[PDB]
Amino acid sequence: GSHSMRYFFTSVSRPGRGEPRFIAVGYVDDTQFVRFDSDAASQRMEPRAPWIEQEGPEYWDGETRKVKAHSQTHRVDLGTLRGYYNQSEAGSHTVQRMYGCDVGSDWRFLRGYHQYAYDGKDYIALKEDLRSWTAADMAAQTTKHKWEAAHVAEQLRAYLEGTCVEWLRRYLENGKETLQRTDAPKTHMTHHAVSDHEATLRCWALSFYPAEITLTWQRDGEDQTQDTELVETRPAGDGTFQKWAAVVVPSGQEQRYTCHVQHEGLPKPLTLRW
């Protein structure tokens, strides 16, 4: 299937003393594999998956250098944007960055991205064509002009089409044991009675990865969304994921309803019945 590599950065300004709180994490697909925290003692980029640990000291020197420099850009930006928006020095503010690359099943470049946010709203984003920018307001437009004059997009395009894809490929190979393994959901259904008239069927999907997955109900072979509930996908804590979907039914008619599970690790979707 398709894969991605994606970095996330959060900076939170600290009014009254000192530099922002800065947290960086890196993913391959739904697996975290790197981390920098400004509050941490090491002041290094640190491993968070086993396959990243066979990179040598030069890797961690390099990534530490870059991620610290990342951190300084963000610090500067928080000052800059505060000016842009004519805000006092009194409040805490946030910048957030993600960038990274998707590849398809053949591991070839499919797309990449570079998005930027201020206090939790769109600021500026690299467009799909990787040659142009989306700026959300006039502050963001000033940044756009800057980055247009400096040919930022070209630099990012080279990274996103080249080194991003190359190193994602390396990671996928190195971590094949787990990163190229799909874990189909372990599924079951449960039953719970509200009154004498009404029961709830709950469809469980446990211990699956990647996180992507579809649960649906049918009544008598037809999709039903009414009287259903679907929980956000949550992490199990061991690297896999959980989800459930429930429907309310008239007591005694349980047999009418079926739960349908799609996921990358099942060759054909599954069907469950009480």
Binding site: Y7, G26, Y59, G62, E63, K66, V67, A69, H70, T73, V76, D77, T80, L81, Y99, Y116, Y123, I124, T143, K146, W147, A150, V152, Q155, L156, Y159, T163, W167
Partner: peptide
């Protein structure tokens, strides 16, 4: 690996 340089906004 990370991109090598971020220009200020």
């Amino acid at each position: 690996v990370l991109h090598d340089d971020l220009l200020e906004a």
